[PDB]
Amino acid sequence: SIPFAWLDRDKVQRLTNFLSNLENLENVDLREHPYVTNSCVVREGEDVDELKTLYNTFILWLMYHYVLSKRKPDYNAIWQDITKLQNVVNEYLKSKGLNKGNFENMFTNKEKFESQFSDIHRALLRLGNSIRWGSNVPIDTPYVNLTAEDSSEIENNLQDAEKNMLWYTVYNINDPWDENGYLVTSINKLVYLGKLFVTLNQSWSKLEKVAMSQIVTTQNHLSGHLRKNENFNAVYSQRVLQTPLTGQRVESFLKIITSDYEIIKSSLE
Amino acid sequence: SIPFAWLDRDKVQRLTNFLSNLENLENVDLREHPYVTNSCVVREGEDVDELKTLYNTFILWLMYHYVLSKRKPDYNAIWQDITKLQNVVNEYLKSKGLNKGNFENMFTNKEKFESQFSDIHRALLRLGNSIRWGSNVPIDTPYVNLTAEDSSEIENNLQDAEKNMLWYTVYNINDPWDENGYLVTSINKLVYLGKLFVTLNQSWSKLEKVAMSQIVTTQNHLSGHLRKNENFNAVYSQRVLQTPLTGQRVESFLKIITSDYEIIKSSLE
Amino acid sequence: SIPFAWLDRDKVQRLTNFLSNLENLENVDLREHPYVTNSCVVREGEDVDELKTLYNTFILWLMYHYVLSKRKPDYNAIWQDITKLQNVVNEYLKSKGLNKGNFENMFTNKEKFESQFSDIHRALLRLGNSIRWGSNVPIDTPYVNLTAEDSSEIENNLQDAEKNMLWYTVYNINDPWDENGYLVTSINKLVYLGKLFVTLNQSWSKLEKVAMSQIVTTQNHLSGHLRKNENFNAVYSQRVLQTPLTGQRVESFLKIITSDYEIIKSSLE
Amino acid sequence: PRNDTNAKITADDTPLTQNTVRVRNYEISDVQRMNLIDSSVVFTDNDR
Amino acid sequence: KEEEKKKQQMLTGVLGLQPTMANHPVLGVFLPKYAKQNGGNVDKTAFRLDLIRMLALHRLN
């Protein structure tokens, strides 16, 4: 029942409180918070640490990746609205009027495939077409929509989402009165939602790879340190701590190390 | 309870009063007050100081950075009036009096471009002089208002903001005879608020960069001094104090060293 | 530092508090409330009171006019919206398409007296037009028609403008209920903003003429009592206190009389 | 001269208005105006 | 003690006036105000003209 290492009840309550209210506070990372990493440490010198806080940091990264994989909101709901905008509006207008960019229509139809990482890059040209619809003689507009407050708070919202993937807010672009046209406001909808979707997925994949790399590192340290002992409990803990971990494997591994906790605590000296 | 390593109660009262009235005293910069650093010194001379003033200043720079990031005032309240005067008046006088809607304020679109403001202010000098007189003759006034009785007051206010960006006041305009009727807002006050805003941001990032650089320098010196001892809590303190610190890590690390103060006072030689 | 006469530490603090928070209290007229003028006194009978409290009230009226000239808000801000409504809605209705009148008559009744209009008959023409759009014939209600739920409240707003011309609010007539739509809401806002503009300007001119009349009145009674003595410091105080004042020169003279309060506290008999 | 807001009166690039000009004070005899009789700053009596 | 050297230096800079004229009332009152200046770049001639016009204001029979 989320057991851990030789920590006090205050430190255990700190870890449980952080892992419970992870989604609430901003910028969710262990390199954001050393207070988890240094509340992880055990008292009575560093020999206790070099034997046991390696195990406890291993436990922290396992349970942190677990609460990430349990609490990730699914971003395909906002990709559904991305597909609605891209399928509904842009294909109809470009194939209908100024029908010379049908190859770029097929290009954004290939962007509809799940390869959006390369696709958001150099998307700008289809905002470059909407320059003309927003204002005549299309010289130049900013990288986002024309409205200053909307562009500033869109950049604010993208920074907030990139800090906290687990808790994201939709901006609700729409306006009652528009100098802009309805179709180019749908273009602004598509641009903002595409940026939000690619930002959330890239930051999620970044933290997921960080968690997996730290788990592999701490596995190598634990196996190299517990290599020396020859006891049966020692080699049993070697095998349990030596079983390899993918991200699908990490949940069953957390349940297995829950059951094996009582013998590996005795196996640590 | 704002824990300090080895100080007088008078010295603790001095540093607590400094961090309390940080926003009230002028010239908010820790290098500007030598008596704060001179108050930070430890008793019994250089043999005690060579080990303990490093940790004492390592507390004090971190706490200065903490009260600096906590007592930041929001600079969007002054950018709101920039956008209000800008968007409502500087667009609409151009659209009315046939200045073809020169968008030049909208090249920035944001508080992100701390450059190009000087080009915008020179363009606004040309605009304000063109609206005040038909001659155009681009002149070498600093301000369109032609107010030399209060330009010294405005420069005084800008120097006061440079000294204390934590606590700022905003100046205004007088109306017995107006150079510009309501246009004086979005050309005079726009120049004043733009200079004030970019001044607050530049001084802010300057002080935060100086604080972080001094924290990194005290990390390097104190780790190089504490490297020698191989005792248990000594190298425990090495592993605690060796942790790298960002401005995102710094508040949690203040909580870490607040927890560690009880053990570390015995642990230091 | 905030110069005054031979006063105590309570009266100076109270007058500093009053002239600082001159904006928050209503009915700002210094002639009207006697709690300041009768109380800024040395007491001491009348014999030592006369010549010194004459200078005290002189500084009080002078600094009152200073803080008025510093704390006037711009009324061109409301006349710009007067021009926006009057130009952009009402001319397009009266001359374009619907054309219920003459181009010359309607256009020049709007266009004439851009600066310094105080005309009620132009208003009355727009009132007769709006009530012809309305239900009934007579002009019993000038402003908003068909409804008296807002009439005493708009009169309360105009009385609050008369009381505190330094702090004024716009009524912003309610959207959902109307005699008719866009047209009479534009006419209604035009009449209300014109009345607000002329009310605030007449109140400001009243207080400026009052303050200048009181300052010029006190100069003669000050000069008659100070004329008789023949010391150099005495006659220098005579010349400093007989330097002529206008409302646009009173700020520079306030600085001058601070730098001469350095001496003329001692130059009193 | 009278009603300067029509014209643009200069001695430098700065226009000399009511506001740019410091008023002449004949009694207190500031040292700044004594420096600016050498320099190019224009000074008025406020009488108009 | 601390404030006396500046007054006397400004007195010699103005004209080289003699202490006998330093005792004059127009000087006795204005030397302290000329002390809180002339540390700036202002001028030496301005102080001479100021003393001229003030001494003149003083002597109106």
mmCIF file of C-alpha atoms in Angstrom, chain C residues 22-237:
data_model
loop_
_atom_site.group_PDB
_atom_site.id
_atom_site.type_symbol
_atom_site.label_atom_id
_atom_site.label_comp_id
_atom_site.label_asym_id
_atom_site.label_seq_id
_atom_site.Cartn_x
_atom_site.Cartn_y
_atom_site.Cartn_z
ATOM 1 C CA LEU C 22 -9.276 65.239 -2.477
ATOM 2 C CA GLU C 23 -10.567 62.860 -5.174
ATOM 3 C CA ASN C 24 -12.525 60.428 -2.995
ATOM 4 C CA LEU C 25 -14.845 62.714 -1.050
ATOM 5 C CA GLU C 26 -17.818 64.186 -2.853
ATOM 6 C CA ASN C 27 -18.767 67.888 -3.036
ATOM 7 C CA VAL C 28 -15.169 69.051 -3.313
ATOM 8 C CA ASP C 29 -15.885 72.801 -2.865
ATOM 9 C CA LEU C 30 -13.502 74.308 -0.315
ATOM 10 C CA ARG C 31 -15.773 77.334 0.080
ATOM 11 C CA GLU C 32 -18.599 74.934 0.901
ATOM 12 C CA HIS C 33 -16.989 72.832 3.616
ATOM 13 C CA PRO C 34 -15.586 74.981 6.480
ATOM 14 C CA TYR C 35 -13.801 72.185 8.379
ATOM 15 C CA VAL C 36 -10.473 73.014 6.700
ATOM 16 C CA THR C 37 -10.267 76.811 6.536
ATOM 17 C CA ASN C 38 -11.448 77.623 10.061
ATOM 18 C CA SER C 39 -9.263 74.857 11.500
ATOM 19 C CA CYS C 40 -5.957 75.720 9.774
ATOM 20 C CA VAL C 41 -5.248 78.265 12.511
ATOM 21 C CA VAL C 42 -2.600 78.861 15.211
ATOM 22 C CA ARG C 43 -5.278 79.816 17.718
ATOM 23 C CA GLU C 44 -3.489 82.070 20.242
ATOM 24 C CA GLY C 45 -6.403 84.526 20.277
ATOM 25 C CA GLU C 46 -6.360 86.677 17.148
ATOM 26 C CA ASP C 47 -3.291 88.804 17.848
ATOM 27 C CA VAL C 48 -0.564 86.351 16.824
ATOM 28 C CA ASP C 49 -3.089 84.547 14.613
ATOM 29 C CA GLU C 50 -3.799 87.238 12.007
ATOM 30 C CA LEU C 51 -0.634 87.677 9.928
ATOM 31 C CA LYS C 52 0.473 84.047 10.214
ATOM 32 C CA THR C 53 -2.855 82.401 9.415
ATOM 33 C CA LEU C 54 -3.208 84.781 6.480
ATOM 34 C CA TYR C 55 -0.075 83.152 5.036
ATOM 35 C CA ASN C 56 -1.419 79.753 6.119
ATOM 36 C CA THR C 57 -4.687 80.156 4.199
ATOM 37 C CA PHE C 58 -2.690 81.604 1.281
ATOM 38 C CA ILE C 59 -0.626 78.409 1.073
ATOM 39 C CA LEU C 60 -3.816 76.364 1.574
ATOM 40 C CA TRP C 61 -5.721 77.943 -1.342
ATOM 41 C CA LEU C 62 -2.583 77.923 -3.517
ATOM 42 C CA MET C 63 -1.900 74.234 -2.945
ATOM 43 C CA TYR C 64 -5.607 73.472 -3.412
ATOM 44 C CA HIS C 65 -5.442 75.038 -6.867
ATOM 45 C CA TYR C 66 -2.194 73.143 -7.503
ATOM 46 C CA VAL C 67 -3.718 69.770 -6.681
ATOM 47 C CA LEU C 68 -6.796 70.613 -8.779
ATOM 48 C CA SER C 69 -4.630 71.441 -11.806
ATOM 49 C CA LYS C 70 -2.633 68.254 -11.206
ATOM 50 C CA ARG C 71 -5.646 65.979 -10.660
ATOM 51 C CA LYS C 72 -7.973 67.151 -13.441
ATOM 52 C CA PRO C 73 -8.943 64.221 -15.700
ATOM 53 C CA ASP C 74 -9.218 64.743 -19.443
ATOM 54 C CA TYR C 75 -12.707 65.685 -20.650
ATOM 55 C CA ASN C 76 -11.613 65.417 -24.283
ATOM 56 C CA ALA C 77 -11.932 61.682 -23.596
ATOM 57 C CA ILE C 78 -15.698 62.150 -23.418
ATOM 58 C CA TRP C 79 -15.814 64.714 -26.241
ATOM 59 C CA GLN C 80 -14.062 62.227 -28.531
ATOM 60 C CA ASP C 81 -16.991 59.853 -28.054
ATOM 61 C CA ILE C 82 -19.320 62.834 -28.579
ATOM 62 C CA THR C 83 -17.640 63.309 -31.959
ATOM 63 C CA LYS C 84 -17.745 59.563 -32.665
ATOM 64 C CA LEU C 85 -21.498 59.235 -32.082
ATOM 65 C CA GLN C 86 -22.446 62.609 -33.626
ATOM 66 C CA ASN C 87 -20.346 62.096 -36.752
ATOM 67 C CA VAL C 88 -20.548 58.367 -37.393
ATOM 68 C CA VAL C 89 -24.189 57.553 -36.642
ATOM 69 C CA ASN C 90 -26.357 60.634 -36.764
ATOM 70 C CA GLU C 91 -25.067 62.250 -39.973
ATOM 71 C CA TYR C 92 -25.390 58.925 -41.824
ATOM 72 C CA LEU C 93 -28.974 58.601 -40.673
ATOM 73 C CA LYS C 94 -30.051 62.208 -41.245
ATOM 74 C CA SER C 95 -28.345 62.814 -44.598
ATOM 75 C CA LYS C 96 -27.801 59.378 -46.145
ATOM 76 C CA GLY C 97 -30.628 57.244 -47.492
ATOM 77 C CA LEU C 98 -33.395 58.064 -45.045
ATOM 78 C CA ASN C 99 -32.743 61.837 -45.354
ATOM 79 C CA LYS C 100 -35.490 63.267 -43.128
ATOM 80 C CA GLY C 101 -34.213 66.824 -43.284
ATOM 81 C CA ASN C 102 -31.700 69.052 -45.030
ATOM 82 C CA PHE C 103 -28.004 68.243 -45.529
ATOM 83 C CA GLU C 104 -26.941 71.809 -44.694
ATOM 84 C CA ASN C 105 -29.175 72.248 -41.629
ATOM 85 C CA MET C 106 -28.442 68.917 -39.920
ATOM 86 C CA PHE C 107 -24.756 68.720 -40.934
ATOM 87 C CA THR C 108 -23.932 72.274 -39.844
ATOM 88 C CA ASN C 109 -25.933 72.029 -36.613
ATOM 89 C CA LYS C 110 -23.703 69.066 -35.803
ATOM 90 C CA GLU C 111 -20.550 70.616 -37.265
ATOM 91 C CA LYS C 112 -20.728 74.152 -35.857
ATOM 92 C CA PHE C 113 -18.938 74.940 -32.551
ATOM 93 C CA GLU C 114 -16.607 71.975 -32.280
ATOM 94 C CA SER C 115 -14.691 73.830 -29.577
ATOM 95 C CA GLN C 116 -16.761 75.586 -26.889
ATOM 96 C CA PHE C 117 -20.361 74.673 -27.583
ATOM 97 C CA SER C 118 -22.837 75.324 -24.776
ATOM 98 C CA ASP C 119 -25.958 75.291 -26.945
ATOM 99 C CA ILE C 120 -29.193 73.829 -25.621
ATOM 100 C CA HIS C 121 -31.215 74.483 -28.809
ATOM 101 C CA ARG C 122 -29.149 71.995 -30.852
ATOM 102 C CA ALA C 123 -29.843 69.416 -28.145
ATOM 103 C CA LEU C 124 -33.548 70.411 -28.227
ATOM 104 C CA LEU C 125 -33.665 69.787 -31.985
ATOM 105 C CA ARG C 126 -32.291 66.293 -31.420
ATOM 106 C CA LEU C 127 -34.777 65.878 -28.547
ATOM 107 C CA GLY C 128 -37.691 66.777 -30.807
ATOM 108 C CA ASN C 129 -36.414 64.309 -33.403
ATOM 109 C CA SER C 130 -36.041 61.521 -30.810
ATOM 110 C CA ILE C 131 -39.481 62.153 -29.292
ATOM 111 C CA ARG C 132 -40.989 62.148 -32.801
ATOM 112 C CA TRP C 133 -39.429 58.693 -33.059
ATOM 113 C CA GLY C 134 -40.933 58.092 -29.616
ATOM 114 C CA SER C 135 -44.486 57.519 -28.470
ATOM 115 C CA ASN C 136 -45.687 60.995 -27.499
ATOM 116 C CA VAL C 137 -45.404 64.624 -28.612
ATOM 117 C CA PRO C 138 -44.100 66.874 -25.763
ATOM 118 C CA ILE C 139 -40.556 67.466 -24.521
ATOM 119 C CA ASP C 140 -41.307 66.972 -20.811
ATOM 120 C CA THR C 141 -38.366 64.572 -20.591
ATOM 121 C CA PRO C 142 -35.350 66.003 -22.442
ATOM 122 C CA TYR C 143 -32.995 63.019 -22.321
ATOM 123 C CA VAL C 144 -34.138 59.401 -22.420
ATOM 124 C CA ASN C 145 -37.624 58.913 -23.801
ATOM 125 C CA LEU C 146 -40.423 56.379 -23.076
ATOM 126 C CA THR C 147 -38.851 55.570 -19.682
ATOM 127 C CA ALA C 148 -38.428 57.324 -16.339
ATOM 128 C CA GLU C 149 -36.801 54.415 -14.489
ATOM 129 C CA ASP C 150 -33.421 56.002 -15.296
ATOM 130 C CA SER C 151 -34.289 59.701 -15.164
ATOM 131 C CA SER C 152 -33.658 60.489 -11.497
ATOM 132 C CA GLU C 153 -30.578 58.251 -11.600
ATOM 133 C CA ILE C 154 -29.113 60.150 -14.564
ATOM 134 C CA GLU C 155 -29.889 63.386 -12.699
ATOM 135 C CA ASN C 156 -28.104 61.885 -9.683
ATOM 136 C CA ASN C 157 -25.167 61.173 -12.008
ATOM 137 C CA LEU C 158 -25.115 64.784 -13.201
ATOM 138 C CA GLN C 159 -25.326 66.068 -9.615
ATOM 139 C CA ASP C 160 -22.421 63.773 -8.733
ATOM 140 C CA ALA C 161 -20.524 65.258 -11.681
ATOM 141 C CA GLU C 162 -21.243 68.761 -10.338
ATOM 142 C CA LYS C 163 -20.054 67.674 -6.893
ATOM 143 C CA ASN C 164 -16.904 65.799 -7.988
ATOM 144 C CA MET C 165 -15.799 66.784 -11.489
ATOM 145 C CA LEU C 166 -12.494 65.026 -10.721
ATOM 146 C CA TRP C 167 -14.169 61.585 -10.578
ATOM 147 C CA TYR C 168 -16.984 60.972 -13.062
ATOM 148 C CA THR C 169 -18.780 57.912 -14.446
ATOM 149 C CA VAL C 170 -20.701 57.304 -17.677
ATOM 150 C CA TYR C 171 -24.238 55.969 -17.286
ATOM 151 C CA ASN C 172 -24.123 53.608 -20.328
ATOM 152 C CA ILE C 173 -27.870 53.285 -21.152
ATOM 153 C CA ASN C 174 -29.147 49.689 -20.947
ATOM 154 C CA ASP C 175 -29.208 47.463 -24.038
ATOM 155 C CA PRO C 176 -32.326 45.181 -23.871
ATOM 156 C CA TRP C 177 -35.110 47.757 -23.449
ATOM 157 C CA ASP C 178 -35.397 50.720 -25.787
ATOM 158 C CA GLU C 179 -37.763 53.150 -27.445
ATOM 159 C CA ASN C 180 -36.068 52.150 -30.669
ATOM 160 C CA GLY C 181 -32.681 50.645 -31.321
ATOM 161 C CA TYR C 182 -29.390 51.983 -32.656
ATOM 162 C CA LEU C 183 -30.729 55.430 -33.590
ATOM 163 C CA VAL C 184 -32.268 56.619 -30.322
ATOM 164 C CA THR C 185 -29.535 54.904 -28.307
ATOM 165 C CA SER C 186 -27.040 56.954 -30.334
ATOM 166 C CA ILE C 187 -29.086 60.166 -29.909
ATOM 167 C CA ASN C 188 -29.542 59.379 -26.210
ATOM 168 C CA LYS C 189 -25.836 58.794 -25.579
ATOM 169 C CA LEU C 190 -25.045 61.949 -27.596
ATOM 170 C CA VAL C 191 -27.327 64.140 -25.459
ATOM 171 C CA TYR C 192 -26.113 62.600 -22.184
ATOM 172 C CA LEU C 193 -22.438 62.936 -23.116
ATOM 173 C CA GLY C 194 -22.910 66.532 -24.277
ATOM 174 C CA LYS C 195 -24.608 67.421 -20.994
ATOM 175 C CA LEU C 196 -21.846 65.645 -19.056
ATOM 176 C CA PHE C 197 -19.166 67.514 -21.022
ATOM 177 C CA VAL C 198 -20.650 70.967 -20.499
ATOM 178 C CA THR C 199 -21.364 70.157 -16.823
ATOM 179 C CA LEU C 200 -17.784 69.095 -16.074
ATOM 180 C CA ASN C 201 -16.311 72.089 -17.922
ATOM 181 C CA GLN C 202 -18.568 74.604 -16.161
ATOM 182 C CA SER C 203 -17.744 73.048 -12.775
ATOM 183 C CA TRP C 204 -14.004 73.204 -13.489
ATOM 184 C CA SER C 205 -14.193 76.839 -14.618
ATOM 185 C CA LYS C 206 -16.170 77.649 -11.462
ATOM 186 C CA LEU C 207 -13.539 76.144 -9.163
ATOM 187 C CA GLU C 208 -10.604 77.672 -11.062
ATOM 188 C CA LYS C 209 -12.101 81.172 -10.959
ATOM 189 C CA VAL C 210 -12.924 80.667 -7.258
ATOM 190 C CA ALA C 211 -9.381 79.573 -6.384
ATOM 191 C CA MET C 212 -7.748 82.394 -8.349
ATOM 192 C CA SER C 213 -10.106 84.981 -6.838
ATOM 193 C CA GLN C 214 -9.274 83.774 -3.322
ATOM 194 C CA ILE C 215 -5.516 83.791 -3.978
ATOM 195 C CA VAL C 216 -5.564 87.312 -5.465
ATOM 196 C CA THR C 217 -7.820 88.427 -2.584
ATOM 197 C CA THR C 218 -5.404 87.120 0.051
ATOM 198 C CA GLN C 219 -2.372 88.681 -1.696
ATOM 199 C CA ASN C 220 -3.633 92.219 -1.058
ATOM 200 C CA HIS C 221 -4.363 91.646 2.636
ATOM 201 C CA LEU C 222 -0.975 89.944 2.954
ATOM 202 C CA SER C 223 0.855 92.812 1.253
ATOM 203 C CA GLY C 224 -0.898 95.495 3.303
ATOM 204 C CA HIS C 225 0.204 93.947 6.590
ATOM 205 C CA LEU C 226 3.709 93.147 5.358
ATOM 206 C CA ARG C 227 4.341 96.513 3.671
ATOM 207 C CA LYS C 228 5.123 98.516 6.808
ATOM 208 C CA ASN C 229 8.442 97.032 7.992
ATOM 209 C CA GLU C 230 11.778 98.029 6.480
ATOM 210 C CA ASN C 231 14.188 95.128 7.012
ATOM 211 C CA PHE C 232 15.723 93.465 3.957
ATOM 212 C CA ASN C 233 14.245 90.045 4.772
ATOM 213 C CA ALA C 234 10.900 91.769 5.307
ATOM 214 C CA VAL C 235 10.909 93.566 1.952
ATOM 215 C CA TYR C 236 12.204 90.453 0.192
ATOM 216 C CA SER C 237 9.245 88.541 1.612
#
